[PDB]
Design a protein around this ligand. Structure first.
Ligand SMILES: [Cl-]
Ligand SMILES: [Cl-]
Lengths: 75, 74, 72, 73, 76, 74, 73
């Protein structure tokens, strides 16, 4: 999309499964349902991963953008 | 429906707050602001899934929050 | 909305201030700004629930606060 | 005299190297970026001391965690 | 003190000895000479402390507010 | 120079070799090509050192000022 | 009446000691500084345990790392 609008890539993932990598190495998987300029975001049917192992099924969750390291598409 | 707008849909509901450093909280959300500072009623701290201290009503600065989820009353 | 506008209700009441690092304070909230910087009279710095120091009047920077709860 | 973020502009659609705090490393084609250096990479790959550790495809990296960005091969 | 003006209490400690706690469990004592909006301070006759005992004499020093955890005056 | 414009010093190093010292102690050396008010900067023919021994040659690189502790002449 | 940043101004061109987070320490002549306290030292020297460890000549220090500034030497 716009080379000045990197958050659009997030819009290109609305209702899709994403992978949230947090500072401290924590990982989160779920369906992106929204986000804002601060990258705060809402995940649906989100699950907390550890070394690739689900360790917590939270359901819907709001993640503060400040903690995010990266967001990538996943299955 | 921007992220914070979700918190509104949880006002007066039991939520679970996860803080930096792996500290966790549980209580009924009564208010919040854009910075995600928030007030919890009948709150209580948790460690490894077991309550460690009941703090009743408490104000949490959003800066320390990692995520917030839906919870249940016991 | 009103988290801040709910701290005022404790103005002149005993509060507990938990900080990053687990250091905690107890005392009478006397004033605060929107950044959560606040003043405590008859303050006490605690550890493990044990009074570590009697500070009297103290100004704490909000930036180090984790949470504040209504004391007793 | 192009300031810091222009040199970034000259790498648009070129492979780059992003080095994060905590020493984690990434490689991928730079697709976009903002003033905060929040950026997007396509064909992204995370590295383990010069050894590919994970293929991420398209990824959005928050600038705050970045240390430096270098040109790629 | 004004319920919305915490820094006021700093104004009340001017030219009065104070205790400054910094991030990293470090401490300093001295006489408050000036402070600004960000809690940057200037202490006269300052001293760094550790375990309650002096670690170093610094004289006049300018402390950046950001490193401050809390500022204590006395107790009356 | 201007006792009010410390970044003027950076201006004086444009196209000269500098030593960038980062948080965590990492260290970079290269030729300063440009910078902004946040001290974000570009270096040509840059190299990452370790205890005085270059351990990586990055050529042109963009360093976020945020990680910088200090910058010296080389 | 004096304000921190202005008092700093009182030390332009005199020796000052800059103490940083991590406990690294530098000494040199204050040559310039802005509101963020990013500043410049001429004849700068980093110390460790109280003994010079390296002479860095002119150096630009980011205020963000600064804990305190004191009149030294
Ligand atoms: Cl929620
Ligand atoms: Cl001074």
């Amino acid at each position: 999309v716009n080379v000045q609008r990197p958050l659009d890539a997030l819009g290109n993932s609305l209702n899709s499964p994403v992978i949230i990598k947090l500072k401290g190495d924590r990982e989160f998987r779920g369906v992106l349902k929204s986000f804002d300029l601060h990258m705060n975001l809402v995940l649906n049917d989100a699950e907390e991963l550890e070394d690739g192992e689900v360790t917590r099924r939270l359901g819907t969750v709001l993640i503060r953008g400040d903690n995010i390291v990266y967001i990538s598409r996943g299955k």
